[PDB]
Amino acid sequence: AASSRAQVLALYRAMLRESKRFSAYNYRTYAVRRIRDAFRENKNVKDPVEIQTLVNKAKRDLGVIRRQVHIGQLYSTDKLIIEN
Amino acid sequence: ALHTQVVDHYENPRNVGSLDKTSKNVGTGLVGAPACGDVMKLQIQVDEKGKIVDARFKTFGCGSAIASSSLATEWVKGKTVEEALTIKNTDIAKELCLPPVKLHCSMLAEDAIKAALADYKLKQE
Amino acid sequence: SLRPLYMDVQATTPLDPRVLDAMLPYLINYYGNPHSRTHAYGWESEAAMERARQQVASLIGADPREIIFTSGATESNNIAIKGVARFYRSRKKHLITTQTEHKCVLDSCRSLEAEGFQVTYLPVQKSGIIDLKELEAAIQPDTSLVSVMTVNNEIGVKQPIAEIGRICSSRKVYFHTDAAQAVGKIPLDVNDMKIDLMSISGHKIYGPKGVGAIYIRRRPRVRVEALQSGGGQERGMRSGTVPTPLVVGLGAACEVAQQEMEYDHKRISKLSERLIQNIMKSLPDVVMNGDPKHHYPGCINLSFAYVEGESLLMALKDVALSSGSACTSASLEPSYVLRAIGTDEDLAHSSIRFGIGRFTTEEEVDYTVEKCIQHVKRLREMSPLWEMVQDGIDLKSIKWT
Amino acid sequence: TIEERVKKIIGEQLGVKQEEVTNNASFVEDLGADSLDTVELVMALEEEFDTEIPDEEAEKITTVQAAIDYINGHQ
Ligand SMILES: *P(=O)(O)OCC(C)(C)[C@@H](O)C(=O)NCCC(=O)NCCSC(=O)CCCCCCCCCCC
Ligand SMILES: O=C(O)CN(CCN(CC(=O)O)CC(=O)O)CC(=O)O
């Protein structure tokens, strides 16, 4: 209801870029995968009100990701054996 | 926590294998039970002067069991049959820093040394 | 040093970042006691507590008034078992449970036997599943409680909860299920399943440690004697200071699990099938403990014949796992669960539990499978039992010392 | 390889044999991409080539050749 589509593609890029900054392999791989899967799963929603609900949820989760990426950087640890 | 002395006997295995049970110069000790989660096979090869010249082992058991029996197999080499008989569970435990919950492993390793030696001795008249 | 892969989610889970994010405000500025009635620090802390209560209730189909916060499913199990038994102790002295329950259920029942109660510990079949008809036959006129856990923590096998609730409801016997390993992973509805009490653990569902809950049905009313004495918090059922940050984290984890359960189940099912099939197609003499037809896929318990479990864990040095061999489980006791499903003792020393959770990756599974295949082969080549079997010997014929 | 690691990225991202990834091909019209795919594709190119591609440049990268051109012109 303010170009859902521009909000949506901008959010998609922002969420993927910020989730690649997770220091922890398990949060990072999960967030990137989950975001890809969720936007794809919801691609064919057509009700403008339902789209707006999903967009508002994505904005809330983008805030979660930004905060958690930054507090996983403050308290980071060694990489996992499979990151080598 | 991690126990570097014990894990070494798995990551850097030595003397794992078998000797020829039919040899008059080979003693075989097989002790423990599958149902108790610890079975040690220890074999010694003795030369015609009574010096243990080689030894091999196979163990089903936790890491401390593998280390106890592996250490015992190293330690008998170069000892006379009479000298090997004096290796004690407590020497093995000390070398490996075994905690009290695992001292039963070093005792079964001692039992294995003595079973192998008794097998050898029975073969010499 | 590089860190090992976490494949032990049945032991505990990492916190979902969405859960830590919800908790953090209560650890920084919203630090009020939720029992403080005269000020805004108390009001906002109370309001967060009550929001979390609704989140827990929504996941299981309950009314928030039926949710009591506790310090973990251990405490919830004690409250359900001891609370119900002690309340109806004038009229009822018998309770029924199973041989594969978690240790807090079994030891609560043992404590009650020392109190003069009679307990039937039902056997399970080799599948790990109770026999519903044996449960029916065991209910007595003075039976106050049946307790049967939803998902087993060791082998992952699902008990027929809805069918047990039908049996208990029809005989007016209270039905408790320890749902610690099932909450947020498989559908739970207290009314469709006819559940009277249920134990919930926050740290088994990406929530923080030190918190849990107990569902206590209010219609028809289920009565329980409180165990923790105090000022009457949590409707007189759990006195003490409700830990706002922790219960916020529990409600957030339940909310997230409600939204993510279907996605997780699909993804974990596929990873679980991959791990089981890839190991079994590459190694002989590998057996799954528990019936795969009634099984939560994220808990996989396999036995590797002729290799001792602790040694395999040691060998899998960069993977965090767990085992049923006695020297690894607090260093005391062998697996009573494997014994109850009729596993030969030696094979039960040979069992490993693999956990797959919300954050597990396909590469983490592939790495674990590859190392498992390599190390089982290596430990077999070290094993006198494998050597004897390869020379055609029947281990059942040997006379062990 | 050469600057056509660009071609490898496009094919990996879009599930298209390297044979189909021709210089003239449009991601959407020719290779079946949707707009979620093309967000991911641009990020894949940013990753592979250690370069930042801002929105007004991303919106022009719609064909294989535009992607090659852009990467050649930014080290
Ligand atoms: P393109 O092919 O031109 O267009 C793509 C879109 C999706 C914009 C197009 O198909 C469209 O407009 N569809 C209309 C419906 C729609 O907009 N669906 C998207 C709604 S937004 C959405 O689904 C967000 C889901 C958020 C998932 C976040 C998971 C976070 C996890 C965090 C963990 C710590
Ligand atoms: O996007 C992802 O799924 C995760 N990572 C890659 C995860 N890596 C680990 C690492 O980067 O050290 C995978 C691996 O190395 O196994 C993206 C990124 O690098 O930002």
Domains of chain B, CATH where assigned: 25-125 (3.90.1010.10)
From C208, C188, C205, select the one nearest C298 (Cα to Cα): C205
Residue B97 designated active-site: no
Q: Which atom of ligand 1 is nearest to the CA of A65?
A: 34
Go through chain D and list every residue after which a break occurs, taking a C to next N gap over 2.5 angstroms, comma-separated.
Answer: none
- Tell me whether residues A80 and C1 touch, CB distance under 8 A: no
Residue C312 CA: distances (Å) to CA of B37, B62, C317: 13, 8, 9
Query: Which H or E element spans position C303?
Result: strand C299-304
Distance of alpha carbon C309 from alpha carbon C352, whole angstroms? 6
Q: Do C268 and C356 touch, CB atoms closer than 8 A?
A: yes
Q: Which residues contact C102 (CB under 8 A, 6 or more apart)?
A: C73, C77, C149, C153, C178, C180
Task: Give the pair of three-digit tokens for residue C234.
Answer: 């949590």
Q: Which atom of ligand 2 is nearest to the CA of A84?
A: 15
Q: In what order do the strands lie in the sheet with C143-147?
A: C67-70, C212-216, C197-201, C174-178, C143-147, C94-98, C118-122
Chain A residues closer than 8 Å to D34 by CB: 43
Structural domain that includes position A75: 1-84
Residue of chain C whose Cα is closest to the Cα of B42: C384
Task: Give the pair of three-digit tokens for residue B47.
Answer: 């030369």
Please give the span between the terminal C-alpha atoms of chain A, in angstroms, as a whole number. Answer: 45
Query: Which H or E element spans position C6?
Result: strand C5-6
Task: Give the pair of three-digit tokens for residue C84.
Answer: 């119900």
Backbone φ, ψ for residue C106 (5° rounding): -60, -45
Distance of alpha carbon C359 from alpha carbon C366, whole angstroms? 15
- Tell me whether residues D36 and A17 touch, CB distance under 8 A: no
The label of the residue with tokens 């206590």 reads C216
Residue B105 designated active-site: yes
Q: E strands of chain B, at which residues?
A: 26-33, 38-46, 52-60
The label of the residue with tokens 């209910």 reads C139
Residue C104 is which amino acid?
C
Q: A43 a known binding residue?
A: yes
- Tell me whether residues C359 and A27 touch, CB distance under 8 A: yes
> In 10 A of CB C250, how many CB atoms?
33
Residue C258 CA: distances (Å) to CA of A54, C203, C262, D10: 16, 16, 8, 37
Task: Give the pair of three-digit tokens for residue C76.
Answer: 């919830």
Task: Give the pair of three-digit tokens for residue C178.
Answer: 């320890």
* Domain count for chain A: 1
Residues making up chain C, counted from first to last: 401
Task: Give the pair of three-digit tokens for residue D28.
Answer: 């959407």
> In 10 A of CB C141, how many CB atoms?
8
DSSP letter for C2, please.
P
- Say how many CA atoms lie within 13 Å of D12 toward its Cβ: 12
DSSP letter for D26, please.
B
Chain C residues closer than 8 Å to B102 by CB: 327
The helix/strand/coil state of C212 is strand
Backbone φ, ψ for residue C302 (5° rounding): -115, 140
The helix/strand/coil state of B8 is helix
Distance A83 CA to ligand 2 centre (A): 7
The sign of the torsion formed by the CA atoms of D13, D18, D19, D23 equals: positive
The angle that helices A25-41 and A4-19 make with each other, rounded to 10 degrees, is: 160
Go through chain B and list every residue after which a break occurs, taking a C to next N gap over 2.5 angstroms, comma-separated.
Answer: none
The helix/strand/coil state of C122 is strand
Residue of chain A whose Cα is closest to the Cα of C25: A67
Range B90-98, long-range pairs (CB < 8 A, 24+ positions):
B92/B68, B93/B68, B95/B5, B95/B71, B96/B3, B96/B5, B96/B6, B96/B64, B96/B67, B96/B68, B96/B71, B97/B3, B97/B5, B98/B6, B98/B64, B98/B68
- DSSP percent split of chain C into helix, strand, coil, nearest 5: 45, 15, 40
DSSP letter for C117, please.
-
From B35, B110, B26, B118, select the one nearest B73 (Cα to Cα): B110
Task: Give the pair of three-digit tokens for residue B71.
Answer: 């250490």
Distance B27 CA to ligand 1 centre (A): 73
* Domain count for chain D: 1
C16-260 to CATH, choices 3.40.640.10, 3.30.420.40, 2.40.40.20, 2.70.98.10: 3.40.640.10
Go through chain C and list every residue after which a break occurs, taking a C to next N gap over 2.5 angstroms, comma-separated.
Answer: none
Distance of alpha carbon C82 from alpha carbon C147, whole angstroms? 11
What are the residues facing C69 on neighbouring strands?
A: C213
What is the DSSP pairing of strand C299-304 with strand C143-147? unpaired
What are the residues facing C353 on neighbouring strands?
A: C301, C322
Q: Where are the alpha helices (DSSP H) in A1-84?
A: 4-19, 25-41, 48-74
Residue C399 CA: distances (Å) to CA of B39, C32, C144: 12, 67, 48
Structural domain that includes position D38: 1-75
Task: Give the pair of three-digit tokens for residue C303.
Answer: 């036995």
Distance of alpha carbon C313 from alpha carbon C329, whole angstroms? 12
Distance A64 CA to ligand 1 centre (A): 17
By what method was this entry solved? Answer: X-ray
- Tell me whether residues B37 and C349 touch, CB distance under 8 A: yes
Distance of alpha carbon C177 from alpha carbon C154, whole angstroms? 16
Distance of alpha carbon B105 from alpha carbon C334, whole angstroms? 17
B104 touches chain C (CB under 8 A): no
Distance of alpha carbon C280 from alpha carbon C208, whole angstroms? 35
Task: Give the pair of three-digit tokens for residue B14.
Answer: 């030595």
From C290, C265, C264, select the one nearest C276 (Cα to Cα): C290
Distance of alpha carbon C176 from alpha carbon C195, whole angstroms? 6
Task: Give the pair of three-digit tokens for residue C365.
Answer: 């599974």
Distance of alpha carbon A5 from alpha carbon D38, whole angstroms? 14
Residue C208 CA: distances (Å) to CA of C17, C19, C20, C23, C119: 11, 8, 8, 9, 33
Of B44, B84, B98, B105, the active-site residue reads: B105
The helix/strand/coil state of C154 is coil
The label of the residue with tokens 């990756």 reads C361
What are the residues facing A80 on neighbouring strands?
A: C3
Task: Give the pair of three-digit tokens for residue C164.
Answer: 């047990």
Residues making up chain B, counted from first to last: 125
Cis ω for the linkage preceding C220 (within 30 of 0): yes
Task: Give the pair of three-digit tokens for residue C196.
Answer: 């009277």
What are the residues facing C215 on neighbouring strands?
A: C67, C198
Query: Which H or E element spans position C332?
Result: none
The label of the residue with tokens 């799963």 reads A41
Backbone φ, ψ for residue A81 (5° rounding): -55, -35
Residue of chain C whose Cα is closest to the Cα of B69: C382
What is the DSSP pairing of strand C212-216 with strand C197-201? antiparallel
